[PDB]
Nucleic acid binder design. Structure first.
Ligand SMILES: Nc1ccn([C@H]2C[C@H](O)[C@@H](COP(=O)(O)OP(=O)(O)O)O2)c(=O)n1
Ligand SMILES: [Ca+2]
Ligand SMILES: [Ca+2]
Ligand SMILES: [Ca+2]
Ligand SMILES: [Ca+2]
Length: 343
DNA sequence: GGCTACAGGACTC
DNA sequence: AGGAGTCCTGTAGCC
């Protein structure tokens, strides 16, 4: 198989530049303001000019401002970024029937039937980049390889505004040489667990006892890494269908008082139901983030769809369970709906 | 022994 | 010390 992966560069920040070209060449930081106090919140992303100085996704906005007090700080406008995303995805559909939209800024295309070899794949990648630049003035990075995982790795290597093929010989090189932390699905927690076992490369997973590997990282992750290391990985490129919709908000102060929390919970429900738009969930989960940043939840599945009135009443019962079973104060409160009726 | 539903761990964006 | 969404797993009831 020949897989072509597209990952949009500096996406939210790049969109803001397209809509305001005066931002060109300035550091730009897209922010998620929690509303708790002045500049409370985190960075969603930043462009190269800010990121090169350490302003990276997830850091507190106050910390970004200590590093770059004169950068341009913009509130996240996700609805804008989504609309631009959708248009770019529509452009990509023209290059393959076999296409997976993986996230707000990623797609995988199976181009096995559109091209013969990696040379033709590379050239199609150039054509795609040109098209997206022509139509939307957005730069992207293309990764091309034999499966989804190595196509994503290919793009990681070529970012930003790049294009890279990882041929069959380089897959073997990477199995030996790629830091296993840089494999998709391996975060800091798993990477450290693997270091405890002595595993630094994919190849290392082949010689460790399977039960040892599994005991530390679980069966699925073990089999995943081994299949990659064996160069025997397969994962379908296919239509992702949204399985859950939800909203969680930060409260102005921490609280374990039901009547103080209800209004935030009810706003989260209202916004969630708006986003559901015709989709009818059969399951509801209430999610709380405690003052110490632990996430706790309580959910329920019904044998029918959940009306908004039922969501209100059941959400309170689930929050009640959290308050009954946990003595801590709550900082963020929200809901997630799932198990949609197939309409 | 392996379904199911639920609560939490961990990852991606 | 944001916020959205997904997949896996330990546990316990049930067959
Ligand atoms: N922790 C994160 C990571 C990404 N995002 C959003 C903002 C990013 O522009 C897009 C795409 O993620 P990606 O990790 O590829 O980041 P960039 O494209 O480099 O900005 O998703 C976010 O809101 N929070
Ligand atoms: Ca990506
Ligand atoms: Ca990106
Ligand atoms: Ca990693
Ligand atoms: Ca059995």
């Amino acid at each position: 198989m020949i897989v072509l992966f597209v990952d949009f560069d500096y996406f939210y920040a790049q969109v803001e530049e397209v809509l305001n070209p005066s931002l060109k060449g300035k550091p730009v930081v897209v922010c998620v303001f929690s509303g708790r106090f002045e500049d409370s919140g985190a960075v969603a992303t930043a462009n190269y000019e800010a990121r090169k100085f350490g302003v990276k996704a997830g850091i507190p906005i106050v910390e970004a401002k200590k590093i770059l007090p004169n950068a341009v700080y913009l509130p996240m406008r996700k609805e804008v970024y989504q609309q631009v995303s959708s248009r770019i995805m529509n452009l990509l559909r023209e290059y393959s029937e076999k296409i997976e939209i993986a996230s707000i800024d990623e797609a995988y295309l199976d181009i096995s039937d559109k091209v013969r070899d990696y040379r033709e794949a590379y050239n199609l990648g150039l054509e795609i980049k040109n098209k997206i630049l022509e139509k939307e003035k957005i730069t992207v990075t293309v990764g091309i390889s034999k499966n989804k995982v190595f196509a994503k790795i290919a793009a990681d290597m070529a970012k930003p505004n790049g294009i890279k093929v990882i041929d069959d010989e380089e897959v073997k090189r990477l199995i030996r040489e790629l830091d296993i932390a840089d494999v998709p699905g391996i975060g800091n927690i798993t990477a450290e667990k693997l270091k405890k076992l002595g595993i630094n490369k994919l190849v290392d997973t082949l010689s460790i006892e399977f039960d040892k590997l599994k005991g530390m990282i679980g069966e699925a992750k073990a089999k995943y890494l081994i299949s990659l290391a064996r160069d025997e990985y397969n994962e379908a490129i296919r239509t992702r269908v949204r399985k859950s919709i939800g909203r969680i908000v930060t409260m102005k102060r921490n609280s374990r008082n039901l009547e103080e929390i209800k209004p935030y919970l009810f706003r989260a429900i209202e916004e969630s139901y708006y986003k559901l738009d015709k989709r009818i969930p059969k399951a509801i989960h209430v999610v709380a983030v405690t003052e110490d940043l632990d996430i706790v939840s309580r959910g329920r599945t019904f044998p029918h769809g959940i009306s908004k009135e039922t969501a209100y009443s059941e959400s309170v019962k689930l929050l009640q369970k959290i308050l009954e079973e946990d003595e801590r104060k709550i900082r963020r409160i929200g809901v997630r709906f799932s198990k949609f009726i197939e309409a």
